[PDB]
C-alpha cells in the first residue's frame, strides 16, 4: 500500500537536489519506543485497569509492569514500587500506524489548527502537542469512559536541522510557516 514507496522511491529524490552524498545515512529498522502518560498522582489503585485495556486495542499484546533497580538515592523512593511500565516492539508493525494515523480522522477533530511551532532545535527527536479529546476511526463513539490523550514521538538519526522534516511533510500534514 501507500507506505512501501517510502524506502526506495521517495528516499533517493530527497537526497539529490539538496544533499549530494551516498545512499545510506539518510534515512533503517530498529524498534520505535512508545511511552505512556504518567499515571502516577492522578488517582489511587486504579487507572492501571483502564490502562493496557485501551492500549491493547490500537495495537497488539499488553503492556508490562516493570519496576526500577533496587538502589535508594536522594529522593523519596522505596524498594519494590511499580514505575514506568513500558513495552516497545516491532518487526514490520511500526509502518501502518503511520498511515491510519495521519490521513483519516484528521483533519476531522473539532478545532484543529494547522500551524505548528518549531518543536526541536538541534536534535532529531521532534515533539508534539495533542489535547484530551480526539476522534479516531478505530475507536467507538459512545461507550468509552474517560477520554485518553497520549503524545506521539519519532526517533531519527539526523545531523542538521534541515535535510530533515522534508520527509515528514511528505505525508504528514498540515504544517504551515
Amino acid at each position: 500500500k501507500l507506505h512501501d514507496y517510502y524506502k526506495d522511491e521517495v528516499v533517493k529524490k530527497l537526497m539529490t537536489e539538496f544533499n549530494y552524498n551516498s545512499v545510506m545515512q539518510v534515512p533503517r529498522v530498529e524498534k520505535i519506543t512508545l511511552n505512556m502518560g504518567v499515571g502516577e498522582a492522578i488517582a489511587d489503585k486504579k487507572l492501571l485497569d483502564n490502562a493496557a485495556a485501551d492500549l491493547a486495542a490500537i495495537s497488539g499484546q499488553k503492556p508490562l509492569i516493570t519496576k526500577a533497580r533496587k538502589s535508594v538515592a536522594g529522593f523519596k523512593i522505596r524498594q519494590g514500587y511499580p514505575i514506568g511500565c513500558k513495552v516497545t516492539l516491532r518487526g514490520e508493525r511500526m509502518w501502518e500506524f503511520f498511515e491510519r494515523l495521519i490521513t483519516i480522522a484528521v483533519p476531522r477533530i473539532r478545532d484543529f489548527r494547522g500551524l505548528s511551532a518549531k518543536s526541536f532545535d538541534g536534535r532529531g527527536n521532534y515533539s508534539m502537542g495533542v489535547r484530551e479529546q480526539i476522534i479516531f476511526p478505530e475507536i467507538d463513539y459512545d461507550k468509552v469512559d474517560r477520554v485518553r490523550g497520549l503524545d506521539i514521538t519519532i526517533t531519527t538519526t539526523a545531523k542538521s536541522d534541515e535535510e530533515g522534516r522534508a520527509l515528514l511533510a511528505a505525508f504528514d500534514f498540515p504544517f504551515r510557516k
Partner: protein
Amino acid sequence: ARIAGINIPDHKHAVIALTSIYGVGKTRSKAILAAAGIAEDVKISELSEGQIDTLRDEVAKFVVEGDLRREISMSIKRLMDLGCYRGLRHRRGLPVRGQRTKTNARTRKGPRKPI
C-alpha cells in the same frame, strides 16, 4: 458524563452539571439545554444515552483548555519582550525601587538567593 475537556460532572442537575466547565456556566447552561431539548431538573445519571450525545456535539463547538491558556501566555510574552512597564510588572523581578537592584542590595534582600 464525558463532554468537553475531560469533565466528570457526577451527581448533579443538568444545569450546574455544565456550570463546572471553565467554558460554559449558568447562562450557557439554560441555552444549551433549551436548544437540545433537555430537562434542567434531571440528574446526570438519569440522562439517556441519546440526550448526552446531542449535548456533546453542541458543546463541542467552543473554546477551552490549553489552546486557550497558551494564547494568554503569548499575550503576556508579547508585551514582556517589549519596553512596557506592564510587561515588567508581570515579572516583578525588576527593581521595585531608588538605589540599584542589580547589585549591592542585600541590606533589604538578605542572604544571596539561588539564581
